[PDB]
Amino acid sequence: SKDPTTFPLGCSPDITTPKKGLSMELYSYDFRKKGSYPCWDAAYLDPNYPRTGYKSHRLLAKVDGVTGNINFYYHATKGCTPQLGHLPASYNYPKPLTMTNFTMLLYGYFRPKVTGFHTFTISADDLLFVNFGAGNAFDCCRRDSSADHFGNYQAYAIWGSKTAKDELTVHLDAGVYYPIRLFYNNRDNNGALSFTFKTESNENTVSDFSEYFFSLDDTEEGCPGLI
Ligand SMILES: OC[C@H]1O[C@@H](O[C@@H]2[C@@H](O)[C@@H](O)O[C@H](CO)[C@H]2O)[C@H](O)[C@@H](O)[C@H]1O
Ligand SMILES: [Ca+2]
């Protein structure tokens, strides 16, 4: 199914070794013309923006190997102004960009170290939408064929809501590879992203996904979860 669940389906890759990290795509996201009220564009909140809307914007980059700690907080000096900044080294993107106003997509697989309930906690300024699980995010080693067909969000955080924070609790199996999609936007001013998790297994919070995030090439037959 494509719907969100407490028991997402995962994937079992064959020989070809998973590559470390997620793939990232960076897109432009403009302010409105000077004098507009507000200065920022609300286009990022169109329900189709994370499916088809972002594609109409300028592609800035596509990179592989995104892993480690992917959290960031970018302090702008003021609102309504394009300002330059850099993503954390973990994003494997060494060029400056308009950190005040941009859209970013991350996708790949999450591999647990434990079998049991995982709670992922997210926050964002302005927006982080998470899909998680086969179908919900995308199909097992059939991502290109299924990437636009993601289902309802497992978790989402929008700056301006009560909390700007959400959680996803899911039962996962260790060593299985779960499709994951993160969709981020900054419309104006400061920008933030937090993505961490805990499990029933202990009281450690994971912020560094060096051993958790992976990429698998698509295959003829796909790589459906065998366990
Ligand atoms: O604080 C993060 C938040 O800032 C937003 O802009 C604010 C806006 O809420 C306001 O009242 O005006 C000031 C002008 O400097 C500005 O701080 C922004 O639109 C959001 O995306 C958040 O980043
Ligand atoms: Ca912002």
- The token pair at 187 is 């419309």
Q: Which residues does 79 contact at the CB level (< 8 Å), separation at least 6?
A: 39, 188, 189
**Burial classification of residue 204, based on how many CB atoms lie within 10 Å of its CB (0-12 exposed, 13-18 middle, 19 or more buried):** exposed
The ranges assigned to domains in the chain are 1-227
Q: Name the CA dihedral angle for 182, 119, 99, 66, rounded to a multiple of 10 degrees.
A: -60
User: What is the whole-number distance in angstroms between the Cα of residue 94 and the centre of ligand 1?
Assistant: 27
Reported residue count of the chain is 227
On whether the CB atoms of residues 61 and 25 are closer than 8 A, the answer is: yes
Ligand 1 within 6 A of 159 CB? yes
Q: Residue 78 CA: which ligand 1 atom is closest?
A: 15
Are 177 and 18 contacting, i.e. CB atoms less than 8 angstroms apart? yes
Burial class of 50 by CB neighbour count within 10 A (0 to 12, 13 to 18, 19+): buried
Resolution in Å equals: 2.0
Q: Is the peptide bond before 166 cis (omega within 30 degrees of 0)?
A: no
Among all bound ligands, the one having the nearest atom to the CA of 78 is 1
- Phi and psi, residue 110, nearest 5°: -100, 125
- CB under 8 Å to 146, separation ≥6 — which residues? 135, 138, 139
Nearest to 109 by CA among 220, 217, 2: 217
Task: Check: CB of residue 182 under 8 Å from CB of residue 176.
Answer: no
> What is the C-alpha separation between 63 and 19, in angstroms, rounded?
13
Q: How many CB atoms lie within 10 A of CB 78?
A: 9
Kindly give the distance from the C-alpha atom of residue 138 to the centroid of ligand 2, in angstroms, as a whole number. 28
DSSP state letter for 174: T
- Phi first, then psi: what are they for 146, rounded to 5°? -130, 10
Neighbour count for residue 211 (Cβ, 10 Å): 11
Q: What is the CATH number of domain 1-227?
A: 2.60.120.1560
Question: What number of other Cβ atoms are within 10 A of residue 115's Cβ?
Answer: 16
Q: Give residues whose Cβ lies within 5 Å of ion ligand 2.
A: 125-126, 186, 188-189
Task: Taking the CA atoms of 2, 119, 142 and 50 in sequence, report the sign of the dihedral they define.
Answer: positive
The helix/strand/coil state of 86 is coil
Q: In the PDB record, what is the listed experimental method? A: X-ray
Q: For the chain, first and last CA: distance in Å?
A: 17
Whole-number Å distance between alpha carbons of 116 and 74: 34
What is d(CA 79, CA 67) in angstroms, rounded to the nearest whole number? 30
Choose among 26, 91, 103: nearest CA to 60. 26
Q: Are 112 and 176 in contact (CB under 8 A)?
A: yes
Taking the C-alpha atoms of residue 160 and residue 27, their distance in angstroms, rounded to an integer, is: 22
Q: Residue with structure tokens 């795509």?
A: 25
| All residues at 6 or more sequence positions from 162 whose CB lies less than 8 Å from its CB, including other chains | none
178-186 and 102-110 strand pairing? antiparallel
Phi, psi of 24 (to 5 degrees): -125, 140
